[PDB]
Amino acid sequence: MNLDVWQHIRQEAKELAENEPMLASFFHSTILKHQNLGGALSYLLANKLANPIMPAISLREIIEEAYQSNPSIIDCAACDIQAVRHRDPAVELWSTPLLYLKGFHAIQSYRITHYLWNQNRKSLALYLQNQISVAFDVDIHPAAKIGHGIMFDHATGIVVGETSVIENDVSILQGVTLGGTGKESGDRHPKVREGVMIGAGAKILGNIEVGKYAKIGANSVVLNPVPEYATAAGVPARIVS
Template sequence: MPENSSSNPNNLCKSTHVSVDEAWILLREQAQFVADGEPQLKSLIFDTILNRGNLGQALAARMSRKLAREDMTREELEPILSKVFESQDEIVRSVANDMMAIVDRDAACDSPLEPFLFFKGFMAMITYRVAHHFWKADRKSLALYFQSICSEVFSVDIHPAAQIGCGIMLDHGTSVVIGETAIVEDNVSLLHEVTLGGTGKTSGNRHPIVRTGVLIGAGAKILGRVEIGKCAKVGAGSVVLNDVPAHVTVAGVPAKVRGKSNNPAIDMNQRFECGQI
């Protein structure tokens, strides 16, 4: 079966243009402001941001603190992560796009410092990107280790072989599951308890394709090699078993077309927009 099983090419990290340097400057500015005003966080902020020279170094410090445990200590983790972020510019660009997507879309987020320090959906995406790097490098056991730790620490389970673009927002993140052959394009927003799963014991490409601009509501389950079209919206609690056209809203069990949809991943508008399809 072809990788995509769709006539449309995948749009992965092609439609996002966040500057890593600009994101780093914004992050440092807010970090300094909070460090000056909140002494209890000063040590954390200096260790992970203000004592670091660039975003990659900061990510290695933050994630090694979050992921360290008896299995692999911070002293072991940080050099591994530093090497990944220093050698893989595209990963750092992807993370910068994810971080700024949260600032743009989440009404509860005022600056990039908040996802960097506190948002587990964002940190789960960073961990996935590291795991995906190792999976592609044929270091699959290490990739699966990072997947396992991500599931344990953040309650987000993303297979390292999944293909995921940039500008991704996992809002809350809890109980998000993304299967091995799933494809998620750029500028997609997923709320908690979303599953991009397979059906039965089918081998090969068995997980969904989610096109750019899609919003998937809390608790939605999308199962099998179905395609969710560009800028579609999947209502909370829905079960999707068939392809969804672009620019429509679907909801229900099983999901049915309920209205139109414009740019839901960016607007985060989860209401039904009735009108001619």
């Protein structure tokens, strides 16, 4: 659930350090030498988003503070790991999401920009919003609201707008946009309810509702609300009974 997640990854790292000496020091530095998930995650995120403007060493303190303050940030990471492990047939190890999956890195990094944005650090948040778009190819406005148990499989090209809401247990694939229309401010982005699965390349535009457990077809363009448990596909999207 949480303690299980970190111990599954802890036990795995030991074995993978033995099988691949070239990464032994990486497994030790990232996983094996820390006492909890936050230690591994702040380390990995700091390194992936580093830049001389804001070096890993500086970034890590900012990340740790965030974790110390709102610990739930780490619980959500634990749940996201479990989601990928449970919904992605290609994933066979608990440590894989944590170490190599840019979609998962993008999500946890967004949790940091979301935290900064709500701590009155808009500049640093926009600066990291871009770092995240660059390092992971995922662009999430810091003010978007995203829950836990979320999976961004492959992730390249995902874009989530300012007023977006993604509830728990949502899965999103490469090239999917949750964007808006109009040159005005206010609610103009999608509300994706829990359990929703979005196919690769789908574009959901406007402040529209995406019912829970709905399935959105690859390359579908959703412009109108999608009932709960329904399947929308096509351009524009239609409900396929």
